[PDB]
């Protein structure tokens, strides 16, 4: 986000669907992609209830903000579902309304 020129102060709502569903070893992204496609069609960005109290380390990350309760917005334009795996497997997808 930074090195592309993201206007400073404009953060991204961060979703962590794992709190609710756990981690299906391999079918991870499939669920997350559905999460977004659902947000896209409702504008409801679902909070993260188990976000107890976010690690102080995460403060360094200007461009990300961590919702601990659902936010109903005017709508969303595009989203980024990224994920990682064993054996240096890293994959990112971008979706647009």
């Amino acid at each position: 986000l930074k090195h592309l020129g993201r206007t400073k102060g404009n953060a991204v709502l961060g979703i962590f669907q794992k709190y609710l569903t756990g981690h299906p070893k391999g079918a991870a992204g499939a669920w997350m992609l559905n999460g977004c496609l659902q947000v896209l069609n409702t504008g409801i960005v679902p909070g993260n209830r188990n976000a107890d109290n976010v690690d102080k380390v995460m403060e360094q990350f200007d461009y990300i903000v961590y919702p601990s309760r659902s936010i109903k917005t005017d709508g969303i334009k595009a989203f980024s579902v990224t994920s990682f795996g064993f054996g240096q497997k890293g994959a990112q997808a971008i979706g647009v309304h």
């Binding site: 669907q17 609710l20 569903t21 999460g35 659902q38 409702t42 409801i44 679902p46 209830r49 659902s70």
Partner: protein, 48 residues
């Protein structure tokens, strides 16, 4: 429903209750008098 709203709507309950196998659709006589609609899978009784 859960991820966003945080609990199940009546619509959601019925869906879950259907796949969990707690209710199945019945359509025929039930203790004589005919009947259609949701039924408790365990107790053959009807359910509203």
């Amino acid at each position: 429903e859960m991820e966003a709203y945080g609990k199940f709507s009546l619509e959601g309950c019925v869906e879950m209750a259907w796949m969990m196998g707690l209710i199945k659709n019945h359509n025929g006589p039930l203790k004589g008098k005919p009947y259609s609609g949701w039924v408790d899978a365990k107790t053959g009784e009807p359910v509203d």
